[PDB]
Amino acid sequence: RGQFDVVRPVVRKLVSEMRQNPIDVLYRPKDGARPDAADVLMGMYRTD
Amino acid sequence: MRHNTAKIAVNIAVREQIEAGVGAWRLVTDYEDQSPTSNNQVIRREPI
């Protein structure tokens, strides 16, 4: 029993690309609300 | 439309347009104070 196992360099390559380009919480403000509410929420998000 | 249900609706409709040749979305009526408006009634884009 022998295997090339060609799925792994394809999967592992895409895994490296999403880690170096992470998508994380930010908060941009909404209409009808203060523009400086962004750092209020992030202030306590980044600490815990 | 601050909630993701609006942005998810665009991404569903473009995929089905190419793939199946059809696609659509609805506009629904509800009572929402989490998105404030005059007298707190909003409409949202719900995908099909």
Curated annotation (Swiss-Prot), chain B:
Location(s) in or outside the cell: Virion
Protein's recorded name: Portal protein
Subunit-level organization: Homododecamer. Interacts with the terminase large subunit; this interaction allows the packaging of viral DNA. Interacts (via C-terminus) with the head-to-tail adapter protein gp4; this interaction participates in the head completion. Interacts with the scaffolding protein; this interaction initiates procapsid assembly, thereby ensuring incorporation of only one portal ring per capsid. Interacts with the capsid protein.
Function: Forms the portal vertex of the capsid. This portal plays critical roles in head assembly, genome packaging, neck/tail attachment, and genome ejection. Procapsid assembly may initiate with a nucleation complex composed of portal and scaffolding proteins. The portal protein multimerizes as a single ring-shaped homododecamer arranged around a central channel. Switches upon genome packaging from an asymmetrical conformation in the procapsid (PC-portal) to a symmetrical ring in the mature capsid (MV-portal). This change of conformation may serve as a signal for headful packaging.
Organism domain of life: Viruses
Section of the entire sequence shown: 102 to 149 of 725
UniProt gene name: 1
UniProt family annotation: Belongs to the p22likevirus portal protein family.
